């Protein structure tokens, strides 16, 4: 009906708790995943003889996980209320950053890589972090808890979203943010930005994917498209929306226990992938090969491939 | 090759005529929008 | 060099009819020698090199030009012998039967069936090729539409920075002289 | 056969023209980004 | 008829080349005319 056939897939076991997030390295060789077990998951993935290994040292469950553009380092946000800097290929991590009053909501690297990484904490903290200086960048507070915070492609802007029920645009290098762009509604299922930088795709807790095209330069404050048809979160959940720039695609999780694939520019979605025993927490898309990482509450990562 | 050259000729001059009409319409649009 | 007949549906048969043959009639009016066609049909010709001989030349001249003691017993005895041989041939043909008109009719029916099958196969192949060409023309058409839309949006984005840059120079002078440090720098502000 | 031949062979010309229009679109978009970025930072 | 087909093929190719060059020139002028 919707999905096309079945095709082979890879099931990744070993996660004690529900997987919080899933991501892949820029080279596509390894894929790391975070979960409630407070142990990062390194994976030899892109084809399977094996995954990679298990990473430890997190004092609490990792809320978010991401990899640096270089691939040798990665950042993670955990309930330990400390920014997690991890070196991986060296056998041990990077450094542990402190100063968060509450648990770290999300941590993502910027366009400068290890130089600065945008992060936020459920206390409502929106803060850039310098790393290689053995100290962060700067701290800021806007309204309320920011669910997701990520820097733009030019590293000069930082987009964030959370319980504040608004689209958060932040200017950074000016020691102040950018603008607050929101319609009339309150929902946050997550926040995301496209790779082109001309639009941002945020997840709405009403089960409504909101793609907004505004972009820098000429004033717009416009939108992109309204994606629907799949329920991302039933009541309250954190879903990481990762779009697939290959062709045109948008990947997201769902509370229906099915991976959510959405085509956008066609004014309709893509496909729904069943086979998950629980609600999908996060999904990823490999740039090199058409593979998608499936992280769900079932603690089993399902990586699909299109042939 | 004669019928193929006639169909490819009518399609070539037809697509070139449509490209010249659309190119002239865009040239008139953008050309008239420059001083405004 | 890529023009599909299905690419532009608005103009096909009337699209290039008069003007196309008018420019082609202008080049042919300028000069019309013969090289590829005359050289291609020159070697095989029709009938040239072989030409045969004898009944070929006599039959060609006939094509251009649509136009007694023994003699009694000779033609008479030949008429009698020919009548006897014809009576024997008619005796055998009438003594046996035919069945060959029906047999040969069935054979011709089989040949017609084979020809119809070949025509059906050719029509199927042509239909498949036309389908593939239609799909490729659809993809290239969508890509071309997105290219033209992206070009129009690109021209609008550059024109948006143009006008807002002029208003940024005028307003740069307005705030300039009203605040704006001095009038030197901001009056020279431009895209 | 010749129509699909020349059509498929000359399709990369139209695709390359689309990539050129997209490249000019990124160039104009970046030029407007720096222009209106400096104009916004000049206030 | 093959000679007339070759004349219409070469002449139609010249008209298609000139018209294609004019369409590309007008398209480039329309693209660069906005700034």
Swiss-Prot record, chain A:
Cross-link type Glycyl lysine isopeptide (Lys-Gly) (interchain with G-Cter in SUMO2), residue numbers: 220
Keyword Ubl conjugation: yes
Protein name (database record): U5 small nuclear ribonucleoprotein 40 kDa protein
Name of the gene this protein is made from: SNRNP40
Compartments, record wording: Nucleus
GO BP terms, alphabetized: mRNA splicing, via spliceosome; RNA processing; RNA splicing; RNA splicing, via transesterification reactions
Any one GO molecular-function label of the UniProt entry: RNA binding
Subunit record text: Component of the pre-catalytic and catalytic spliceosome complexes. Component of the postcatalytic spliceosome P complex. Part of the U5 snRNP complex. Interacts with PRPF8. Component of the U4/U6-U5 tri-snRNP complex composed of the U4, U6 and U5 snRNAs and at least PRPF3, PRPF4, PRPF6, PRPF8, PRPF31, SNRNP200, TXNL4A, WDR57, SNRNP40, DDX23, CD2BP2, PPIH, SNU13, EFTUD2, SART1 and USP39. Component of the minor spliceosome, which splices U12-type introns.
GO cellular component: catalytic step 2 spliceosome; cytosol; nuclear speck; nucleoplasm; nucleus; sno(s)RNA-containing ribonucleoprotein complex; U2-type catalytic step 2 spliceosome; U4/U6 x U5 tri-snRNP complex
PANTHER family reported for this sequence: U5 SMALL NUCLEAR RIBONUCLEOPROTEIN 40 KDA PROTEIN
Keywords: Isopeptide bond, Methylation, mRNA processing, mRNA splicing, Nucleus, Repeat, Spliceosome, Ubl conjugation, WD repeat
Lineage, top ranks: Eukaryota, Metazoa, Chordata, Craniata, Vertebrata
Species of origin: Homo sapiens (Human)
Swiss-Prot record, chain C:
Effect of residue 105 to S: In a colorectal cancer sample; somatic mutation
Primary site of residence: nucleus
Disulfide bond positions: none
Keywords: Acetylation, Coiled coil, mRNA processing, mRNA splicing, Nucleus, Phosphoprotein, Spliceosome
Coiled coil location: 104-188
One Gene Ontology term, aspect cellular component: nucleus
Localization annotation: Nucleus; Nucleus, Nucleolus
A GO biological-process term: alternative mRNA splicing, via spliceosome
Organ and tissue specificity: Ubiquitously expressed.
Keyword Coiled coil assigned: yes
InterPro entries: SPF27
UniProt-listed PANTHER family: BCAS2 PROTEIN (PTHR13296), PRE-MRNA-SPLICING FACTOR SPF27 (PTHR13296:SF0)
Assembly mode: Component of the pre-catalytic and catalytic spliceosome complexes. Component of the postcatalytic spliceosome P complex. Component of the PRP19-CDC5L splicing complex composed of a core complex comprising a homotetramer of PRPF19, CDC5L, PLRG1 and BCAS2, and at least three less stably associated proteins CTNNBL1, CWC15 and HSPA8. Interacts directly in the complex with PRPF19, CDC5L and PLRG1.
Similarity comment: Belongs to the SPF27 family.
Protein name: Pre-mRNA-splicing factor SPF27
Gene from which this protein is expressed: BCAS2
Swiss-Prot record, chain D:
Coiled coil: 12-43
Reported modifications of this chain: Phosphorylated on serine and threonine residues. Has no effect on subcellular location nor on homodimerization. Phosphorylated in vitro by CDK2. Phosphorylation enhances interaction with PPP1R8.
Location in the cell: Nucleus; Nucleus speckle; Cytoplasm
Expressing tissues: Ubiquitously expressed in both fetal and adult tissues.
Family to which this protein belongs: Belongs to the CEF1 family.
Assembly, per entry: Homodimer. Interacts with DAPK3. Component of the precatalytic, catalytic and postcatalytic spliceosome complexes. Part of a spliceosomal 'core' complex consisting of CDC5L, PLRG1, SPF27, CCAP1, CCAP3 and CCAP6. Interacts with PLRG1, Lodestar/TTF2, and NIPP1/PPP1R8. Component of the minor spliceosome, which splices U12-type introns. Within this complex, interacts with SCNM1. Component of the PRP19-CDC5L splicing complex composed of a core complex comprising a homotetramer of PRPF19, CDC5L, PLRG1 and BCAS2, and at least three less stably associated proteins CTNNBL1, CWC15 and HSPA8.
Illness the protein is tied to: A chromosomal aberration involving CDC5L is found in multicystic renal dysplasia. Translocation t(6;19)(p21;q13.1) with USF2.
Protein name according to UniProt: Cell division cycle 5-like protein
Gene this chain is encoded by: CDC5L
From Swiss-Prot, chain E:
Tissues expressing the protein: Ubiquitous. Weakly expressed in senescent cells of different tissue origins. Highly expressed in tumor cell lines.
Stated induction or repression of this protein's expression: By gamma irradiation and chemical mutagens but not by UV irradiation.
Record PTM N6-acetyllysine, positions in chain: 21
Top-rank taxon, per record: Eukaryota
Compartmental location: Nucleus; Nucleus, Nucleoplasm; Cytoplasm, Cytoskeleton, Spindle; Cytoplasm
Domain notes: The 7 WD repeats are necessary and sufficient to support interaction with the RPA complex.
UniProt function note: Ubiquitin-protein ligase which is a core component of several complexes mainly involved pre-mRNA splicing and DNA repair. Required for pre-mRNA splicing as component of the spliceosome. Core component of the PRP19C/Prp19 complex/NTC/Nineteen complex which is part of the spliceosome and participates in its assembly, its remodeling and is required for its activity. During assembly of the spliceosome, mediates 'Lys-63'-linked polyubiquitination of the U4 spliceosomal protein PRPF3.
Family: Belongs to the WD repeat PRP19 family.
The name this protein goes by in its record: Pre-mRNA-processing factor 19
Organism: Homo sapiens
Portion of the parent chain present: 102 to 136 of 504
